[PDB]
Amino acid sequence: MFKDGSLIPYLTAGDPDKQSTLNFLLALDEYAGAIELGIPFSDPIADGKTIQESHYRALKNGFKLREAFWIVKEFRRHSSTPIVLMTYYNPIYRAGVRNFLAEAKASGVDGILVVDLPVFHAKEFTEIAREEGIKTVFLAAPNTPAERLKVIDDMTTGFVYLVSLYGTEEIPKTAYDLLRRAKRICRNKVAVGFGVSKREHVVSLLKEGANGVVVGSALVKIIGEKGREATEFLKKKVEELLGI
Numbered sequence: 001m002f003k004d005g006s007l008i009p010y011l012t013a014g015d016p017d018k019q020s021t022l023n024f025l026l027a028l029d030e031y032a033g034a035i036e037l038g039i040p041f042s043d044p045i046a047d048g049k050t051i052q053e054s055h056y057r058a059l060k061n062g063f064k065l066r067e068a069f070w071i072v073k074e075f076r077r078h079s080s081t082p083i084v085l086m087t088y089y090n091p092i093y094r095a096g097v098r099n100f101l102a103e104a105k106a107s108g109v110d111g112i113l114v115v116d117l118p119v120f121h122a123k124e125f126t127e128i129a130r131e132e133g134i135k136t137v138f139l140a141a142p143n144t145p146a147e148r149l150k151v152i153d154d155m156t157t158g159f160v161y162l163v164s165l166y167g168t169e170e171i172p173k174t175a176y177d178l179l180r181r182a183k184r185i186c187r188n189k190v191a192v193g194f195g196v197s198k199r200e201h202v203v204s205l206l207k208e209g210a211n212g213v214v215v216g217s218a219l220v221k222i223i224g225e226k227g228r229e230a231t232e233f234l235k236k237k238v239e240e241l242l243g244i
Helices: 018-031 049-060 067-078 089-094 097-107 119-131 146-155 173-183 199-207 217-229 231-242
Strands: 006-012 035-038 083-087 111-114 135-140 159-163 190-193 212-215
Touching: 006 018, 006 049, 006 190, 006 217, 006 231, 018 035, 018 067, 018 217, 018 231, 035 049, 035 067, 049 217, 067 083, 067 097, 083 089, 089 097, 097 119, 119 135, 119 146, 135 146, 146 159, 146 173, 159 173, 173 190, 199 212, 199 231, 212 217, 212 231, 217 231
Parallel strands: 006 035, 006 212, 035 083, 083 111, 111 135, 135 159, 159 190, 190 212
Antiparallel strands: none
16 A cells, blocks of 8 residues: 555554644655554553553544544545554444445545454455445454465455554564565565664664554654654654655
8 A cells, every 4th residue: 555665654543633634744744655543542551551542542632533634634635645544343333334444534534543353354444445446455463374465465455463461672683584474474564563763673673574664652752752753753753764
């Protein structure tokens, strides 16, 4: 869904507010090959400490689901950079799958990632997504075996997203091992969310086969620290990670 060598920012919607989120996106767009926009959820059990707290912040400040389409729609007025919406199933199941996908498609979303999509629903989800024009993005962790990777790659229309809960400040062997394994199997492009935070992390991961590197924790850390004034700080962190 993005160019090879891409840096892919991840931001939580409504952290600290939908307005600041828009500002951050517009500020990082020039460095982004694609963008992941996260929908805060009450029980973000799949996320690491940093991202979990951004979910809490966003919600505390009173974020509401569709406030995410506002961010996208507005962003679209300025950019055409691919946008991937990341969410938990709950919000979508409760709000009607097809209805959500359709609305997202209208707001300008290109692909969706449902962190905890029940395998029991995977198929129907992928089909509805295809009918609504939304590309799919599936996750795989260090404990995802070769056989599951294949099945994941086969249902993926957007790209395969590899993560590492591990954190770091070096990238764990187990994470490199996952990338390596994913490359010998996936036909789709793969992006990695391994909690990078240093230029060597970006250089290394790209060199090792990552089509794109996601950058979330490093950005969300700054945002929870600088609030609405995090903009320029984000630009510098991204430039540092880019070597510019």
